[PDB]
Design a protein around this ligand. Structure first.
Ligand SMILES: CN(C)c1ccc2c(-c3ccccc3C(=O)O)c3ccc(=[N+](C)C)cc-3oc2c1
Length: 153
């Protein structure tokens, strides 16, 4: 995990997001539809996202899990309906940059977990991906996602 993996201490950033329970079969259309309804709201308000979208994965129950996914925005933006105000995760974290298709992102979860065991830290359970590249616009072998495992201190 040399060079590639690093520890970080993260601050909450304000976001608009949707919190829901889903599986991996349904994630794709869910994110497409939800992210689009988020940008439609921000467009309607003249507000721009302050950064790339993300998803917080947690609540694992067999194939299912909860997820909060959205866009980070500036302070003072309000939601509507299913789009609620929220915050990015915070705390100590192990961060690595994954490049490749989402159906092979386990590659970096394995590595980020061995580097956690082999350095005497522990997981808080929840993961946090940041989608630096739009997958619609980006070759799958160039798709940049930052993978962030929240640690427990
Ligand atoms: C780096 N920026 C600017 C962006 C912008 C948009 C997306 C959309 C999206 C948003 C709305 C409509 C289509 C797409 C898409 O492109 O399919 C993503 C969609 C899904 C996604 N996963 C993790 C499944 C990840 C997505 O990441 C994005 C990143």
């Amino acid at each position: 995990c040399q060079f590639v993996c690093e520890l970080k201490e993260l601050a909450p950033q304000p976001a608009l997001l949707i919190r829901t329970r889903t599986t991996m079969s349904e994630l794709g259309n869910l994110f497409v539809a939800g992210y689009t309804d988020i940008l439609q709201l921000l467009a309607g308000q003249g507000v721009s996202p302050s950064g790339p979208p993300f998803a917080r994965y947690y609540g694992f129950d067999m194939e299912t899990f909860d997820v909060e996914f959205g866009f980070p925005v500036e302070g003072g933006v309000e939601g509507s309906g299913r789009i609620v105000t929220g915050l990015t995760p915070s705390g100590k974290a192990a961060s690595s940059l994954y490049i490749g298709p989402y159906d092979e992102i386990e590659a970096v979860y394995d590595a980020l977990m061995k580097w956690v065991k082999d350095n005497g830290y522990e997981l808080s359970g929840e993961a946090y991906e940041i989608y630096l590249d739009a997958p619609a616009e980006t070759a799958p072998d160039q798709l940049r996602t930052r993978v962030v495992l929240m640690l427990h201190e």
